[PDB]
Structures are given as C-alpha cells and as structure tokens.
Amino acid sequence: QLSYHWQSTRHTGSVHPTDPPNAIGQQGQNIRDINGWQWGDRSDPMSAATRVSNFHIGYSWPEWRIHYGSGGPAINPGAPFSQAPWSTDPQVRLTQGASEKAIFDYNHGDDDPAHRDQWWQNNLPITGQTNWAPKNAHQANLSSNVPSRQEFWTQDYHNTFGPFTAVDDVGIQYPWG
Amino acid sequence: SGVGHSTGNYNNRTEFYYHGDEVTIVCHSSRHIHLNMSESEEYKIYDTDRGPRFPTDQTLQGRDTINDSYHAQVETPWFLINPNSWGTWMNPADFQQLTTTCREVTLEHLDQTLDNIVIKTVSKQGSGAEETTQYNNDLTALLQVALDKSNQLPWVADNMYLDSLGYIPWRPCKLKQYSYHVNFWNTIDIISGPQQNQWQQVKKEIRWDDLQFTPIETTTEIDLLRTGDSWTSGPYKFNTKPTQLSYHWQSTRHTGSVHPTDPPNAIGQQGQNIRDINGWQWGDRSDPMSAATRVSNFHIGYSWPEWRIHYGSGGPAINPGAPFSQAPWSTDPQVRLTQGASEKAIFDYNHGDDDPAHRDQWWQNNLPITGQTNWAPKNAHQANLSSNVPSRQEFWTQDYHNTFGPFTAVDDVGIQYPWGAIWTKTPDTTHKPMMSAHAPFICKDGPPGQLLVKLAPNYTENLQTDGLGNNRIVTYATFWWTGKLILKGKLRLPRQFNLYNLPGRPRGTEAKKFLPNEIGHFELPFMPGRCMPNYTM
Amino acid sequence: SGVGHSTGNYNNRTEFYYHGDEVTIVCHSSRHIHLNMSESEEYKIYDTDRGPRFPTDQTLQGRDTINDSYHAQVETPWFLINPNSWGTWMNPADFQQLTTTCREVTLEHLDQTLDNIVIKTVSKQGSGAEETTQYNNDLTALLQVALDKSNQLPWVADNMYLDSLGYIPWRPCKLKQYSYHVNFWNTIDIISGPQQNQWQQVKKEIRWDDLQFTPIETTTEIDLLRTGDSWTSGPYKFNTKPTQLSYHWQSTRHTGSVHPTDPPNAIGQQGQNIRDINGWQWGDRSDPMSAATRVSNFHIGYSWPEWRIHYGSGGPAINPGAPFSQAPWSTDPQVRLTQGASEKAIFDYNHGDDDPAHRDQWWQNNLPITGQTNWAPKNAHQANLSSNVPSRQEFWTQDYHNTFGPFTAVDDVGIQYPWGAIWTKTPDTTHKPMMSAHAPFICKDGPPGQLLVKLAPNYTENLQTDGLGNNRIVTYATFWWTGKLILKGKLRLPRQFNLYNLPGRPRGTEAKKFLPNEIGHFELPFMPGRCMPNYTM
Amino acid sequence: WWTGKLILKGKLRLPRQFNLYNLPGRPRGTEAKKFLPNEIGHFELPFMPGRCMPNYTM
Amino acid sequence: GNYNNRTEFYYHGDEVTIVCHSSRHIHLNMSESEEYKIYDTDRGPRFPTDQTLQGRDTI
Ligand SMILES: CC(=O)N[C@H]1[C@H]([C@H](O)[C@H](O)CO)O[C@@](O)(C(=O)O)C[C@@H]1O
Ligand SMILES: CC(=O)N[C@H]1[C@H]([C@H](O)[C@H](O)CO)O[C@@](O)(C(=O)O)C[C@@H]1O
Ligand SMILES: CC(=O)N[C@H]1[C@H]([C@H](O)[C@H](O)CO)O[C@@](O)(C(=O)O)C[C@@H]1O
C-alpha cells in the first residue's frame, strides 16, 4: 500500500449522534439518550468509547521486547505506528512506534565522505494504529457503574494482537529500505 | 407513471425453499419512509464536547474517562437508508424457521428499489389564533438519490447506533443524516501527575493539514426523481463466508479421548478414574496421569485483558476479547458478570421496544456459548509441569495475559437477531482481521453501496446568499423502500437420539410481551442465532 | 416527462483517462440555477455616470481619471448562463491532479443541457399583519432559451466581472442579465489647460447615428420550454492551441552556452570566470569577454511603458505589458510591486469566498515566472558597445520604451485556476492578436455560443400598454444546468534527478482556510496553472 | 559493470476527496539544497515515506 | 554491454508499468584469502564487563 491510514477504532464506522453547532464558535453536542450497541451491560452512558465495533485497529505490545534467544538477545518488534499524537515536547524522542534508524554513508546517500549520516524513521503519518502500551488500561466489568480503584489496572504491557486485529506494515522506506 | 400511476407495490413476505441439503431464503422487505428537508444545504465540519459523564476533575482518578464521546465529523445534508440489520428483513417466526431448519447460512444477493415518491409543501395561513396548515402536493419537486456502488464514500452503515430501517412492516421509518469522522487527535493520559493517578488531555483537536473532505456531489453520480419516477439499485452480489447457526459447549476438557474410567455398578455410583494408565502428558508428568495435563492438539478459547481500554489517537475504545458465556462461573444471578465480551442493545419503538418515549435494552450475555469460556482472573501459570506440585513461588495467578496463539480455536458471536448488524466492510490494512466481533458477515470486496437520499431544496422567490432555511419552502417527502435479500442455508438434521431444545423466546420472557396489546404496542424477542448445541470435535 | 417525470440527472464528477502520452480529462458539472422574472420586458439603451472615485476637480491633476466607468449599453431582458471559468468545471483536487500529471492541455469538446424546469408563482394573501405567501406551481408557464451558435450576438462572456456559474456543486447559482456596449465616445484630455496639468472631457455621448441594436428575438431562434421539457445544446468542438502547464525561470542570461569557468577546488570556493576566451560578443567588444555582452539568437521578455493608460474612444483602459514575476526585485515584502502585469481577482461566496456579505480578493503576482522579468525603469541603453565604457552622456536610464520585437520570446500568464476565464473570442480585425493577456485559450473560430435564458412573461387578466410589472404575475423558476467539458493533456514525466515541488495550496495559506468550517463556509485556493519549472532552451 | 532491470506494476491513484492533497516531497524540516550537489559534488538523498498520502481504512 | 540508468513509466487505464534500469560500475579486489573460514567473534563495543548497569547493557 502506498497510503497511510489515519483512522483508529474511534475514527471508523458510525459517528456518535450529534446535533450540529448553530454558529462559528460553537461545537457539536453529543446526543444523550440514543440507541445503539454498547460493550458489556452498559446503557446509561451511551458513549463512543464503549460503542461496539467489528474489528480493532492496531495492537499493544511489550514495546522494545528483548528476546534473548539461543544466539543472544534480539528485539522482538511490535507494530509500526506514529507517536505524534503523544509527542508534545519535540526534544524528547519517543521511539515506541517500532521506529527504525538508517545509518548510511557516501555511496548510500550521505553527502560527506569519512562521516556517516543517519535518518530516524518514526512513521509520523501512521496514526490510528497508534498503540502505546503504558497508556492503556483494563477494567473488571464494563457497565453503567465506574469501577473502583481496584478493578482498574494501568501500565500492563500485554500483547493485544488477536483475531479481531487489523494492522498495517511499515511500507516502502525509499532510500535505504 | 405520470402523476396518477403507482411506480411499485409492497412485498414483506419471507419465502423458504427446501431442496436436498440446500435451503433458499428470500426476504422481501418494504418500508414507508418519511423524509424531511435537510436542516441545512451545507457540508459542515466541527468537533464536539466530551459527552455526558466525562470527568471534569480527578475524583475518580480518570477511571471515568472511558465516558469520552469526543470526535470531529463532516456533517452532510444527505440521509442514509440502511437495511443492515436482521428484523428489517425477517419477522420472529421467519427467523425461528431459519434457525430451526438451517445449520449454517450465507448471504447471496441484495436488490433495492425506491418508488411512489410523494413530495409535499406546507403552507400556514392566518395569524396565530386562526393559524391553519395546508399540505399541498408539489408535483415538479425533486428527490435526490445517490448510491455509492464503488464504495468511494466513508462506510458508516454498521448499525452500531441502530440507524437501520425499522423492524415492523406497518410503521413508518425516519432516516438519520449521513456523517463520517474526519482526522482528529483525542489523546488522554490516565497515568499523568505524581503517583500516576491523574488523567490529563494530551492532544484534542481536528487535523486540518491532513483532513479528507469528500462530498456526495463530486464523488458519485446523483439521480433526480419526480413523483412519477422510480429507482432501482441493480443486483448486488455478496462475497462472504457462512455463519454457524450452532453453539459449541466443548472446552478442551470436553474434546477428544476420555480419561480411562471403570463404569459405576449401580444407580448412585460415579465412575472411577483409572490410576495407572498410559498416554501423552504435558511436560515431564507421568505419576499423576490426569485429564487436565493430557496433551491436546488444539486449545479452545483464549484469555485476554478483558474490557481492555485502548486509548488510541481519537480517544479510548474497548479492545474486545473473545465472546463466551459466564454461566459456568455465575452463581449469584444478582451480580452481572459482563466479561464474556457480552453486548447490550439499546433500542426504541421502531426497533422493537413496546413503549414510545422510553427506550428498551437487551443485555446479550451469550449464555449458551461455553467451553470457550476463558475468564482471565481465574487462570494460572506454573514454572514446570511434572510429578511434583510447584511451590508457592513458581505458581502465578490473576495474570490477565493474552493467550491467543497459533493453536487456538475460537467462535465468533454469530447472528444477533433483532438488533444485530448483518454485514460489515473489511478495513483496508496490510493484515485483515481474522474474524468479526459483531457483524456475522464480512464482505470480502466492498459491502452493499450506501444508499443516500436528500430532498432537493425548494427555494422561495428571493434567493439571498445570507439566507439558509428562510429562502427554502418547507418541504417533506414520503416514499417506499423495497428490498430483496437472498440467503442460502444448509439444512439441519438431528445428530442425536434425544430431543433438542428448539428455538423460542428468551428464558424469562412470556409470549404476551412479543404480541400487540390493546393499543398495538409490542416488542420483538431476542433470538440467539447460535441456538442449538453441536459438536466441535 | 409530463409533469411528474425528471428530465435529467446530476453528474459533477471529473474523470481522468491515461493512455500512453495522452490524458483525457472529462469534467462533468451540474448546477442548480435560480431565475427570477426579468425586471422589465423591454430592451433599453442608456449611458451611465462616471462611477466611484472619478474626479470632480483638478485636486489630483486628472491622475484619478483612471477611475472612469462611463459607458453606454443596451439593457436586455435576457439572462446569461456562462460556464467560462475553471472552478465551475473542476474542484481543487481535480485541478491539482491535472497540473501534476499533465505538461500541457487543450480544450476538445463542450456539451450542455438544461432540465428539470420548475416555474412557480407567488401569491400573497391577507393584509400586512396576517400577510401570508403562497408558492404555487404554474404547470403551463414557459422558459425561453436562446443559444447563439452562430455568434451573431455581441460576445460578453469573458468572466472579467466573474459572472460565471458558481464553483461549489451544492450551492444554487443566480444569473446576470445579458447586456452589451453600444457605440459611445468617452474622450478625456489629461494634458488640458496651461501647464498641461488639467484633465477635461472632450466627447462623452452615445453615437446614435451609428448605433447597432441587436435584440435576441430577431437574431436567433428561441426554444420555449414547459416543466416536462428539456434542452440540449448539441456538441461544440473547440479549435484552439494547448496551454503550457510549466513556468519558465530562464532569462537570456540563463540560456545557451555558459561563460567559461574553472571549477572551485573546495567547499567554500566559487567558480572563476575565465579571462581570455574566444566567442561572439555584441558590437566591437573583445577585451571584456562577458556573459552580458555575449551574442544570443533570441531575447526572453520585453520591456513596456508598464501600466500604460490608453485613453481611447470610450475612455481610458490599461494597455497590458507582458506577465512576469517581480520576486527578483522585491526585497521588502511590505511594498507590493505590481508591474509584472499582475492581476487581482475580487470574488464572493458563490465564487469561493468563505464569508457571505463580504467579498474576498486574491492578488495574482505570478511569482514563479522569472527570466522574462523585465521592469522598464531598471533598463538602460548606451550609444556604443565596445571595450570602452561610455561616458555619462552616451548612457541612458529609465526610458520606458517598448522592446517587443522580432527576436522576442515571451510566455502568456496561463491558467488561473479558481477565477480565471477558460476561453476567449478572437477579435475580428485585420491583425489578430498573437497571444492573450488573460484567457488561456483563444477560439480560432467562434467561441461556445452564449446561452441566454428568460422566463416568459406571465400576465395578469388586465393588460395595459402603460403597465410594466403590474400586469405581470410574480414568477420565478429553478432548473438544472449540466455541462460536459473534455480536455486533452500531455503527460508530465520527471525531467530531472532531484525532487519537484508539487502543486499545492499557496504559500502563506493553511489547509483549514480551504475546508468547510462549523457552518459550512470555505474558500477555494488559487492554483497557478504554471506550477512547475521547465527548461525554455 | 552490473546492469539490472526491475519491472514494477502499480495501480493508479485518483483523487478521492474534494480538497487538496499534500503531495510527496522532501521531509519536513529539510531544505532542497541538502539534496542537491554542492561545489565539490556532494549531496544527500531524501527519505521518502512510501506511505505518503491519507486514505480511508473503512 | 551498454549503460542504461533510465526509469520508464507507462500509464494504461488503471495500470502503471514502471521499468527501472540501473547500471553500476563495480570495483572488485582480490579475495583476502582463498579459504573458507569458521570463527566466532568478541561481544562488540559497549557490551558490559561487569554489573554496573545490572545487565541492561547486554542488549
Ligand atoms: C538524513 C539526515 O540528514 N538525517 C538527520 C536526522 C533526521 O533529521 C531525523 O533522524 C529524522 O527523524 O537527524 C539527525 O540529527 C538524527 O537525529 O540522527 C541526523 C541527521 O541530521
Ligand atoms: C428486551 C427487554 O425487555 N430487555 C430487558 C432486559 C433483558 O431481560 C436482559 O438484559 C437480558 O439479558 O433486562 C433489562 O432489565 C436490563 O437488564 O437491561 C431491560 C429489559 O427489561
Ligand atoms: C483568497 C484570499 O484570501 N486572498 C487574500 C490575499 C492574498 O493572500 C494575496 O492577494 C495573494 O497575493 O491577501 C489579501 O489580504 C490582499 O492582499 O488582498 C486579501 C486576502 O486576505
């Protein structure tokens, strides 16, 4: 594929019912009492986050997994995605989208002989499969009630690849790939 | 047809044809549609608020950020006609017939028409006291019809908000405006602050530099129809796979060779597991030859960080685990165990609730599907599997790992009769999903084209650029949608000696609930779609 | 079609077809047109006032007489449907596609239709307080359509006032009345009085003895259409030349043989022009062998008394010099250098401004076109060209002469995407113009015929000769224009090793400006039409 | 001298939207001179993404 | 043989054909030995000699 995909699960399918804004500064207003399919036993808060979907875009992963096989440690790669939605400070470099780095030289497209050049490929356009493991959570039940402090977990680092998952590969990386 | 000739008739019959092992189900559906004038003639792009219940503070430590509805969309003057839901095509007795006589079913063909277009304008004479309303036919007014057959438009016809045509043939249907998401970022950090117990917004905005805007008029050709005019979609052919009409009760402990047992000798006695036997066992385990450590070829079901919350770009979303019944763990019926990837349909009068002005709801917990039951917190793992029992360390519980793997066999949810979607579009990504979390049929090529309709604007004599709905005669339309959906099943024949439990209404329900009352209100029953036991192996 | 059958459909798609070196672009456009009743049924001849800002005195010494709008015209009850503008035929992504994949493009074919005619009358009941307005279909009323295929009518469809059909497919369009100039004299002397610093009118009047009056009814046949009726133009075939989709950066100093140079030896060093060389030089100049005095075969660009004001019969008019970029002379971005024959489009909501009630404007300065840059005040001429530098006398600056001549090579402006005209009529004179100052295509034979429409008068029961609009039932119409414009391009393939700058929005603009906002307002971007560098020689 | 011939088969890309695309070009923070020969003939090749343009997933 | 580094594009309908010609001038020295050799290596730069980083640098 020569295209990048911006759609996450929240970008796909039916849009949450909204009444339009009436003027230039106004935002749409999510409708409160609506019908639909929701996950678990959840009807009171009809919300886009708990809307059922057919598939799921992207998966989480123990990012920068180090395998340590026979023959030594090796990176077990997670899926490629952009960290641009989480970035904020451009000084700190978030490497976790399975980004790659090409180190190259004069014959491979560096300008200066005797010094190697390098390009960090962070995959900035690929969003919507963005899946930073530490930012996820899981809860015991999904209902009209908010779970307590226990019953809610963060920073798990599980692999969420499964039979419902749709995910893109990195694609062509032109000079060095 | 001119003005005084009908352009079509009404067929809501379902027809069954049995030949050999093959059954052909022809579903005719006809609906009378009420269409108003579009609230504006403009395409609009805007984002929204968070929606009800999203936190304003850290009282719940961001656990309630799962309530986020934030999104950005491109409003479109067009209305969507979506027949993607069982109930729009089959009444309860028809679907009962389907799930009684068929072991599996596939989609084969879809045809659609629109006809008998009536467009009226409303006139209001007199002042408030003697205000009189006149409804006049506008014989030259136009209805606009766009069918996107090439699937060039964003696909939003998944029925997840139950936008589908209504389920009961004698009531009128209304339509929802077509809208789709644009590119936005909705990143929320739930581990922000010291102690990592605070939620903070990271990026919430529309991505204009990247945004995609695809109006109907420049993407598809549009048919213009007057009152004597009719419209047909032409044939659509499904390319999909059959869905199973059975539920599977077999776990890994129910499958394959049975542990050697000597029979009981009398009525109250139980079988006695044989002690010294041969066989294959996992690890280096021979002394305790036991069914639990018997080797198997495959594994039924997988565990999962159940009710996984993803928090992607665009906000949190449930990453669904596999469907299964919590009935084996239930005990107390008061507590509701939601963890089998259960779903809940919230619906209304046109979608099968009895009372107008109040919505009804059905919690689909998938009680028959056991044996892929895999509640994460109940599992364990141990360092070694041997004749020795591992110590306290070397044994772990309550892990919440994903156990999906190359040896895994697992069922999808199957048809959910009244409210469930029928088909779904395949996402265009490098790795296509292996199975669907809700819709039983995945269209390998494009799904049926989205049928979009809009009443052409009927202007007053003074057309001002500053005006919106002022220079627009108040106009509405009624017309008739008809459709034909062909299904192909395989016949179901008895595989057992004893009696089956045949499909019927849900357990705790009485027939009167699904029958018209004094004023004509009734509900449609949930029907499982995997209604009967079958062997997995 | 009778009364309840549509006479046409809606296609706004643009289609691209690539075969070998040839590209075929099929532009479908459909517009919903709102037409009122003509303000009078009479042809009128009248002249005007001077217009805003024309001097009443000698405060500015007549320099502000350039503000003259005076003219005489023959008002005509007819309305013009003019599709002569990019934007009426192509959306921004389509035109981006065109200018990315095509090195040049020609016009090939034009087809037009009118259909789905709706004619309504307005009734007003009750006194002011309870005044109620009724809109009734008049099923027997007539629309008049005249296409002048023989070009017997004065051609006024040049889009210079932006009278063209609107650019965004989902909005309605209104039409301007057809009118054309009659013979008048508007001579203003700007060197009048002692000191020759005073402006005085010489002749300002209509030339009745010579005047030409050509009404529609006696010049062309007229089609009469009721609501069930449709109209087609038939095929029109363009005879024109291709327009270049590239901009040229090469001046005479950029072309041909390079001055002999020895290379730099290291990163900070510059080449060193060789001193003693052979070659051809202008005049008797050999000692200073220099690139400036190198002989060439041709000369790129010409100078001109820039912003020439003609003051003909009928008043002052700009005599345009060649288009070029002032970017090489710019420096301060605050001061705006207008002298490259730059143009300015002033436009409104239907023509691609976002805000109703306020007009927007784009100054087209032609920044990529350099190398024909020829600012008159910066040139010079010298008596002789030799090894000797001429004295103070023998050297002249700031001349403002016209340097167009037989050795001159010069580009026209090219396509100006949103607002620019497409074609133009060739003036019928002994010497045909060599090139066009604005419209990219010059029709060698007649241009597409002017499409004129007028709603037939709907009279009351009492027809009085003294009456005008009293004996005329208030009547308006809506109908649908469709058109098909076929373009033939030549494919653009990379001529260089390095990356091109591909067509996109203008420099200082953000994508949101060209995307619908909350209420649906947006602008269309200017696209240059010469978007990419190419070699001249 | 090595010579080679590699044949690729693509599918054409046509506009799926009304508005303007961002067309492939050099990376964001880079200037064209970096990818052009200098006085002594040294230059770099630009990274090009290979997924360069938005498309709908569903 | 001759030298062709041209890339050629051919557009027909929905199909594009891209023909990439590449030519390279190759410099080849004599092999440093004529023998096949089997050997293992050292750890490489930055691999820990001690437990200062608790083995995090064993990557
Ligand atoms: C080809 C090239 O010049 N690469 C430059 C990269 C890229 O700009 C980024 O890696 C892109 O993500 O930046 C560096 O400083 C770096 O971070 O290693 C090295 C170098 O200056
Ligand atoms: C269609 C219908 O009437 N649904 C009823 C459901 C179902 O009995 C269960 O959800 C099945 O699991 O029960 C409810 O009380 C509920 O829990 O939301 C609502 C409603 O009374
Ligand atoms: C379409 C549009 O928005 N046009 C803008 C122009 C252009 O940026 C320049 O004219 C380009 O040369 O700038 C103005 O301020 C101006 O100078 O008249 C008006 C307006 O803001």
Residue numbers in the entry:
A (entry chain k): 276 to 452
B (entry chain i), C (entry chain h): 33 to 569
D (entry chain k): 512 to 569
E (entry chain k): 40 to 98
Task: Give the text the authors published on this PDB structure.
BuV1 is a member of the Protoparvovirus genus of the Parvoviridae family. Similar to all known parvoviruses, BuV1 assembles into a T = 1 icosahedral capsid. The gross capsid morphology includes pores at the 5-fold vertices, protrusions surrounding the 3-fold axes, a depression region at the 2-fold axes, and a wall separating the depressed regions near the 2- and 5-fold axes. The VPs have an eight-stranded β-barrel motif and an α-helix that form the core of the capsid, which is characteristic of all members of the Parvoviridae.
Additionally, SIA is identified as the terminal glycan receptor for BuV1, and its capsid binding pocket is identified on the 2/5-fold wall. To identify the SIA binding site on the BuV1 capsid, BuV1 VLPs composed of only VP2 were purified. Additional density not attributed to the protein model was clearly visible along the 2-/5-fold wall. Interestingly, only the terminal SIA was able to be fitted into the density in a conformation that leaves the 2′-oxygen exposed to bulk solvent. It is likely that the other two sugar moieties are not visible in the cryo-EM reconstruction due to the flexibility of these moieties in bulk solution, as they are unlikely to interact with the BuV1 capsid, consistent with the observations of the glycan array. The ε-amine of K545 with SIA O10, the backbone carbonyl of Q393 with N5, both the amino nitrogen of Q393 and the ε-amine of K376 to O1B, and the guanidinium moiety of R368 with O1A. Analysis of the binding site by PDBePISA calculated that the sialic acid occludes ~250 Å2 of the capsid surface. However, an overlay of the SIA binding pocket from BuV1 with the structures of BuV2 and BuV3 at pH 7.4 demonstrates that the binding pocket is conserved between these viruses, suggesting that SIA is likely important for cell attachment for these related viruses. The quality of the electron density map allowed for the assignment of most side-chain conformations. However, a surface loop between L495 and N502 exhibited poor density, as previously described, likely due to loop flexibility.
